[PDB]
Amino acid sequence: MKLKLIVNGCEAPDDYKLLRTTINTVASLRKTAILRFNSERLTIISTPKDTGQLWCTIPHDVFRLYTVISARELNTITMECNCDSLLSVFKRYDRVMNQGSSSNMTIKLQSPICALGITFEEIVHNKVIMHSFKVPVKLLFRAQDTRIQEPMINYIQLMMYKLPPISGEFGSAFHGFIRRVERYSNVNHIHLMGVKVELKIIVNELDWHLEICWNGPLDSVISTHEVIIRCKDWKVCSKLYAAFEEVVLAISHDESCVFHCSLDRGRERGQIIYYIARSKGL
Amino acid sequence: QQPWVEKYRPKNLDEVTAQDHAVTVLKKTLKSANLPHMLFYGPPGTGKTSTILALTKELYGPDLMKSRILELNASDERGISIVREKVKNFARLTVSKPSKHDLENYPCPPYKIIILDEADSMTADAQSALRRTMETYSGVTRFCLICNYVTRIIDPLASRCSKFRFKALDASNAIDRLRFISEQENVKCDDGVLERILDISAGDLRRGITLLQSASKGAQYLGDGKNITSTQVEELAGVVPHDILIEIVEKVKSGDFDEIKKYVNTFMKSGWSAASVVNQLHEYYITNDNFDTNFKNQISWLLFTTDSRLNNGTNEHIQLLNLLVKISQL
Amino acid sequence: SKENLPWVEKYRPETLDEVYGQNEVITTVRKFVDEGKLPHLLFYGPPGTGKTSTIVALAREIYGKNYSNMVLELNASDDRGIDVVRNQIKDFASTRQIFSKGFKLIILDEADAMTNAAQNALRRVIERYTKNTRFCVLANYAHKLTPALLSRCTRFRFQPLPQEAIERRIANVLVHEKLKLSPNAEKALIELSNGDMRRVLNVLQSCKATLDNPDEDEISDDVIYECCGAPRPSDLKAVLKSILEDDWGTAHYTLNKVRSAKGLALIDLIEGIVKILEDYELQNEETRVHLLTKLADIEYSISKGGNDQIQGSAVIGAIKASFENET
Amino acid sequence: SLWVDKYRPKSLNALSHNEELTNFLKSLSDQPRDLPHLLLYGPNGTGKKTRCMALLESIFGPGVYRLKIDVRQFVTASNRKLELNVVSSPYHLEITPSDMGNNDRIVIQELLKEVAQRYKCVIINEANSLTKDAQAALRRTMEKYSKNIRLIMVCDSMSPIIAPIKSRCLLIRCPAPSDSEISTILSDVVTNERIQLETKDILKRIAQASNGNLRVSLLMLESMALNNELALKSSSPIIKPDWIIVIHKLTRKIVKERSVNSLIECRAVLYDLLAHCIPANIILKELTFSLLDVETLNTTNKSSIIEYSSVFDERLSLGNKAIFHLEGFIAKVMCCLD
DNA sequence: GATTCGTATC
DNA sequence: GCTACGGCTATACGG
DNA sequence: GATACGAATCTTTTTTTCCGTATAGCCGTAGC
Ligand SMILES: Nc1ncnc2c1ncn2[C@@H]1O[C@H](COP(=O)(O)OP(=O)(O)OP(O)(O)=S)[C@@H](O)[C@H]1O
Ligand SMILES: Nc1ncnc2c1ncn2[C@@H]1O[C@H](COP(=O)(O)OP(=O)(O)OP(O)(O)=S)[C@@H](O)[C@H]1O
């Protein structure tokens, strides 16, 4: 039960941004989060158990040092922590470099309920100001960890859409297309449309209809695909799309929707998957 | 394919049988556009839903129906808030413009119809909110209320809505429809059959059609190619055989509590419904001429009390035993 | 497009002189208007008596063209909770008149459905801003209103429509629609109306629909009974005679034959027999009790449903047993 | 496990206690496309559920018994979590109103809306437990979605089922077997597992002590077999449910002592029975029938008892608190017997 | 409102 | 001079 | 010392509106 890690944001930008995006997403989704510290990767899980699940994979090479030892299988240390305290710590550490610094963030598991000793340094202008934090966490049991599993997705009718990268010419237009439905206050369900490439956002109600359509170029990696989902999950999808260049959208006919985000670190690639159940039936 | 009840559901207003008055009123409403708010009430399986669906089909056609009809039943929430927002918004909506095909093939009335099926399950507050909703928007929206119990509809709504009682479908009322269904489904029956079916199915064509379908399925399974007799019909309808009823009457005649209790235990061990045997006993006792006027009055009141108790979802065994004991002491 | 409307919402009176039946109330409110003083009116009566039509015509007469902004009408279809009463009603009855002077009119249609807290808040608005605003309350049940609200409101009782008002309205409808009505059908229509004009209008529309060719064809009592599905008086008299005089088997046969001839309902026969027996002279006072009680439970059981033949036999037995007390 | 499910006939041809009902089920299963909604009514423990499962196997093939138990969550008009268990199987759904009370309308509404979207058969055990609102939704749900769903509900004493639902279904009666058929089934069971079985008369005793109940008779047989050291005796006592013994003792106390203190003791016994989650309607039924087997009561007392039983079970059906009607019935019996 | 036990006062 | 982010505020939700 | 007086005990898990908190949207100012 000896967990210790060191994070340096300035040394490696992309994976630190991935970690910050994962923390922001799990904080925005719901309170508390599951941190599974496997010996070769760290998985951050937000399980509400209709509401979606976020399964982000963070390789061990992301952090400068990843000593993980426990009596469980493959040194699996599973912990539940409040995202708000971790989010506040990460905001402080982000402002530490924003004011100008390159100090590392040391995290140790100092003692079932434990706490992480997230301590880092900051220099104003040549002064030493030690920032010490202790976030109370609970230690999930081994069987309780086994009760949490990533939901597999069937491929019988599931169809992939390769959304354009946001760094490209069409990326800003596609981001505007995604957020075009967010400017309506009285929207709770978005009914997607894909026929076999077009992505259509349809919001049909008693006395008003909406027909947002994407006329730009799109790719499907390698038939109608309709699923109606809540608007709050679509906000999370839009937030994830902006922070990831490689974004893959999977739509299942009246079953589910999958928002796949991948960060090409090559090296093991960091991936974020947001499984979303249909709010209601077609 | 489909069950005969849904397969032979009327499509036009002409296919609806024995309800001549309401059908004629709706047919004359087709040639006009002054259709009032209708209140369809009557026994179950009398064709109220079929009649309203046929009228809806004839008024607008398959295309304008989706935009000019709103249907709410007991399977969806119909609270005071639902009436105050969804129904009011639909009634306030402007009438959709018919197409050239709709205006050339259908009358296309300048109003729309809101159908509230199973209105007997609606609370009084919802009906109170419905009152001025129908009254204010009567020229742009029409209301149809379908129920089985008139008393569950408040007095102001019964005043606003035109009343259309649906007659119970007896043997003479639906014998033509049953004969047509039997001929179209190639069903062979003896003389007097389908009449016993409509007698058992008291004021119900759905039950009679289901009974005919079950008898036809049994005959097809037998494979002998023989006409269905009334004995088989009574058996799968749940009608107690006349021998068992005769034994019941004979044991009741000898006013012994123990024998009656033992026979009632044996009888309820056979799973017979108390309502059917109570109806059979009522028919036997009222029809028979061996009893005087006072006995008939007392037996009628006792059977009425037993039927009212049974309709309240009470124990069949206790009610049947008490009724038979009271008969034995009459 | 008044030809595209149901007859109930086609003959709604537009002026006060077009409202029949309640002559006293109409004269009183007209005197109120001519004198220039109008109290906080309260209209009470059975449905279809003409309360909404009367108050709407009164408001139109007072404000000929400013009806849109001088009249605030709220009913059960709109939310009338504590917040609506606190905000919207106060804002309406707190500002000055636009240019019509006089007073502001607030109509509370079906105020019996309002909550007690709403009425408690409304009473102070009524008694506070009465200088420039007058309230009208329409209700069919006075037990659902706060006693203070009844205290501060002048009560007007809307009686059920008498015969002559029904005759006049029916004559106007016949003149408008070019229809003919037999006197026997006229008598049948008023009896089934039960002091309700909406029922009369609906039955008249159904009878006009019943006729194969509306013109050159009179509406007889047979047409009325066929359209509305009500038993004829002769059928009721025959059924009562068979029950009272004949034995059990033939009385049951007569009841079954009468009911199956036209598909009549047992509850309608029960109501007809109750109405006929009220005119009977019973010298025991126990027959009355037995009849009323047994028929009441039979009617209640019919309302809950059950076996129809058993209920008919129960009616026959109840009548026979009750009339056995007259010996 | 227990002998009740050990010898449960899985197939349609394995049902050998009704014969005519088996032939009728074969007739129904000949062409499943035109199969209407079915309602099975009869005595408890007859085997109606076994007939339904055998029919489903006759239609959809073996595999209907591959039950997976799932957990479902529902929300009423207000914010509330309803943890309803669902025992689904290929082309088969199971719903029971036992766990859910007055909230039984929204659960069946959501379940039938989701399942209704060939057809999928849905089984509703204990159809009498609905509160006349789930029935109001169900009538339209089955009338409009008859193409993609079929409803087969089992029940006993179908009087509390509303008229439209009974009109929308095929009425199938399942009579309880005779004592000889129960004895034959028990003989087959003891042939499959030898139990000595000194005399054939004890099988008839078990059959007569169950009043035409297969489950109760099998439970009795297993209990005597396990208690008598894997054997049976001609003089072995008849084992009966504990609440039956308690009700019999209550009847004896009522007959013996008729006073206010005895009334309070009877109230305590009724409270214990209610706390043991025994429904009050069958408590009144068993108490009434145990009073009628008392040999020291004349015919007038028995008639008064049965009349009070009818009045008070109607009152309990139209009541809210069950203790009032049970106490009233016991007090009326005491005031009639004295 | 009832019962039961303990005090303060007449 | 423009954009990002923090603070203020209006609205829906919950119990 | 008799009696009036006082204490302790005899007990519990649909609909409307309202009170305070959560949250998203928009404006103003620091920084690039
Ligand atoms: N007059 C009729 N003519 C033809 N078919 C009829 C008639 N009345 C009833 N039916 C048949 O009865 C079945 C059910 O009819 P419905 O109209 O749905 O029942 P219902 O009148 O709504 O009674 P409910 O729903 O219990 S209130 C269908 O198969 C119809 O074809
Ligand atoms: N005295 C009357 N004279 C003429 N028509 C009348 C009269 N009373 C009622 N009516 C007709 O009946 C219709 C309904 O009456 P309303 O006045 O609108 O309702 P109401 O009398 O207020 O009954 P409630 O209590 O509101 S349900 C009117 O639109 C008229 O067509």
Ligand SMILES: Nc1ncnc2c1ncn2[C@@H]1O[C@H](COP(=O)(O)OP(=O)(O)O)[C@@H](O)[C@H]1O
């Ligand atoms: N034909 C039969 N042969 C043998 N056992 C039967 C038969 N029918 C029913 N049973 C027994 O009845 C038991 C349960 O009956 P069940 O289906 O629960 O009755 P119900 O449907 O009335 O509740 C089963 O364990 C089964 O062994």
Ligand SMILES: [Mg+2]
């Ligand atoms: Mg219907």
Ligand SMILES: [Mg+2]
């Ligand atoms: Mg009105």
